[PDB]
Amino acid sequence: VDQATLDKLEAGFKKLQEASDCKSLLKKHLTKDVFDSIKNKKTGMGATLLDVIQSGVENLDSGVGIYAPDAESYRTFGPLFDPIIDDYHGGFKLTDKHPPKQWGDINTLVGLDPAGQFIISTRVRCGRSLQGYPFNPCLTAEQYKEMEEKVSSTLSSMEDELKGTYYPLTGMSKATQQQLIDDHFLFKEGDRFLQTANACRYWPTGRGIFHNDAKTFLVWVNEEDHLRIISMQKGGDLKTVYKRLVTAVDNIESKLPFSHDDRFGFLTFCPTNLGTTMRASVHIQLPKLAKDRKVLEDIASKFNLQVRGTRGEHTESEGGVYDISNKRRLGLTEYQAVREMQDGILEMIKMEKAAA
């Protein structure tokens, strides 16, 4: 690592230390002991510690604040990643390893709010990274297009309920893009956390969305992860939403090789998405409990749930609609992750019903 980068690293570390309003896992876990032991290391593709932490240093309102520029980073910068991973996912020791993939018995899942009194819509997503390619900060324009081609060709072979069309972002009018974002289907553009991680280079080249006609099955191409695979619909029928996702993922996996790690499970760009990579969420109205976002978040955390705004993370609630989802993704099976969301939401609804 050259001196120019070391100087920037030193400057970055001091900013973290001195920022007392900062509450990120990066600030918590990047001690001088940890920093000194990894600050001179470099991965095989040239990623340095600066590439890992810069988003967290530039955005002190970060909750996590680090990203993996390549797969090797998870090990090279292990002394930083490991404790953050343990903290975020609720206990994952140096000796732990993520369990093998297990979708579980779908028939044991339930519809969440049959009367339709609370839940507006249910969504389950996973992330996948393609074998042989690095994460966003290390990709060339040529690689973004090559991956786009590989993925869109594969998706063109989906059938039946999952048959759909691929829409590149480059070919999309501003009006169409905005409508798809407003209706919760498409990823937003210009995320400052991703931008400062050097994760949006060459935008919008190689980025797009695949979906079926009903927009119940969607795939995002080259946003935060190489693939995000999404099943969603109005109402609370988690069993149907999840079953569609399982079918889609199993189908795609037989056609595209994904990066899997013996310890971390499926590899992703942000460590909060490792393992199952699963985020199962509802858009839900809890008028009595959500009088105060703070009390809502406190209750949620008791059930290992996270709370996000209506348009996704780092947004506000619109009309009292919150996004509530399982927080943990590593160290438990896919079935356990979707169960943690189902069981927690059922308890939160019970609490809402008894609330004054």
Ligand X SMILES: Nc1ncnc2c1ncn2[C@@H]1O[C@H](COP(=O)(O)OP(=O)(O)O)[C@@H](O)[C@H]1O
Ligand Y SMILES: NC(=[NH2+])NCCC[C@H](N)C(=O)O
**19: contact with ligand Y by CB under 6 A:** no
User: Is residue 64 marked as binding?
Assistant: yes
Instruction: Tell me the closest approach of the beta carbon of residue 58 to ligand Y, in angstroms.
Output: 10
- H or E stretch including 79? helix 78-88
Structure token pair of residue 330: 């590593």
Catalytic residue (one of 126, 207, 270, 276): 270
Binding piece for ligand X, criterion CB under 6 A, among 117-125, 140-148, 166-174, 203-211: 117-125
238 close to 280: Cβ distance less than 8 angstroms: yes
Given the rule CB under 6 A, which of 70-78, 164-172, 202-210, 281-289 is the region that contacts ligand X?
281-289
- Choose the stretch contacting ligand X; rule: CB under 6 A; options: 58-66, 122-130, 161-169, 346-354: 122-130
Binding residue count for ligand Y, defined by CB under 6 A = 11
Our answer to whether residue 308 is catalytic in this structure is yes
Window 56-95: residues binding ligand Y (CB under 6 A): 62-65
Which CB, 112 or 227, lies closer to ligand Y?
227
The H or E element spanning position 344 is helix 334-354
List, as one string, the DSSP characters of 157-175.
Answer: T--GGG--EEEEGGG--HH
| Catalytic residue list contains 224 | yes
313 binds ligand Y (CB under 6 A): yes
* Cβ(326)–Cβ(341) below 8 Å: yes
Tell me, yes or no, if 270 is annotated catalytic: yes
138 among annotated binding-site residues: no
**Which of the following is catalytic: 76, 272, 276, 277?**
272
Which of the following is catalytic: 126, 138, 223, 228?
228
Candidate list 272, 281, 326, 342; residue touching ligand Y; CB under 6 A: 272
| 12 Cα distance to chain centroid | 25
What stretches of the chain adopt beta strand conformation (E)? 119-128, 165-168, 208-211, 217-221, 227-234, 260-261, 265-266, 279-285, 305-308, 321-326
The piece of 90-98, 160-168, 250-258, 275-283 that touches ligand X (CB under 6 A) is 275-283
Spell out the residues 6+ positions from residue 221 whose beta carbon is closer than 8 angstroms to its own: 147, 148, 151, 152, 166, 206, 207, 208, 209, 210, 227
Residue 148 binding: pick among ligand Y, ligand X, none (C-beta 5-8 Å cut-off by kind): none
339 is in an annotated binding site: no
The pair of structure tokens assigned to 127 is: 């992330």
Binding partner selected for residue 193 from ligand Y, ligand X, none, CB under the kind-specific 5 to 8 Å limit: ligand Y
Q: Is 272 one of the annotated active-site residues of the chain?
A: yes
Query: Using CA atoms, how far apart are residues 99 and 106, in angstroms rounded to an integer?
Result: 18
The phi, psi pair for 43, rounded to 5°, reads: -80, 175
Q: Should residue 193 be labelled a site residue for ligand Y when binding is judged by CB under 6 A?
A: yes
CA dist., res. 85 & res. 190, Å (int): 26
Please list every residue from 318 through 337 that binds ligand X, using CB under 6 A: 323
With both helix axes pointing from N to C terminus, report the angle between 78-88 and 49-58 in degrees, rounded to the nearest 10. 50
Residues in contact with ligand Y by CB under 6 A are: 24, 55, 62-65, 193, 224, 270, 272, 313
Active-site residues, by number, are 125, 224, 228, 270, 272, 279, 308, 313
Residues in contact with ligand X by CB under 6 A are: 121-123, 125, 184, 232, 279, 281-283, 308, 311-313, 323
